[PDB]
Design a protein around this ligand. Structure first.
Ligand SMILES: [Cl-]
Ligand SMILES: [Cl-]
Lengths: 118, 118
């Protein structure tokens, strides 16, 4: 679920979830336009991943509790049988690692209302 | 913000927000397909409202705190000057009221993976 995604974020990276709350055109709730950079691209993919999760029976991306472990900075998704669980854990793990590896452009914090996200 | 929306939900209606965590094709996170009914259309509109809220400077739908009052079952949005606050409070008030007046088809709970939402 979301609380797990937040912990995965700090597991895999140096920045916590709050630094992404309002980044670019896609980090944080919804969004539109072209993802401004790699990081934004990360959030763009994650949004879609969550959308697809809904296409799975009894699967809610924000409340679904999955199984995972953190051996800082390593994240491991343990689910195999529970498809919904494995799918969402993958979404989050992917995003968490993506966030960690991508550069954070302070120039792109707060642009969702600018030409950039049109 | 989201916490204010939850309270608005039980202010205006009988059912609380948990009642709308996994309903139709659009209640809850994201969604796709055709809203199956009135209630689902309520959620469909809200989602769009939130994602339009981003096109406002310093406006994040999930964390922006606005001014509102609840005189059960009446919700009043107080903001005039703070455009972001005013716009978002409206999104939430509209949804909250829409949820209250719309019928709750239990038959439409858990269908996001079915043919209904494609
Ligand atoms: Cl398993
Ligand atoms: Cl005011």
């Amino acid at each position: 679920n979301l609380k797990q995604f937040k912990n995965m974020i700090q597991c895999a990276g140096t920045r916590t979830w709050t630094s992404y709350i309002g980044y670019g055109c896609y980090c944080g709730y919804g969004g539109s336009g072209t993802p401004v950079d790699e990081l934004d691209r990360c959030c763009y993919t994650h949004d879609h991943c969550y959308n697809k999760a809904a296409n799975i029976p009894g699967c809610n991306p924000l409340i679904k509790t999955y199984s995972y472990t953190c051996t800082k900075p390593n994240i491991t998704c343990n689910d195999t049988s529970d498809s919904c669980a494995r799918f969402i854990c993958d979404c989050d793990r992917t995003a968490a690692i993506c966030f960690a590896s991508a550069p954070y452009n302070i120039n792109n914090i707060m642009i969702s209302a600018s030409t950039s996200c049109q």
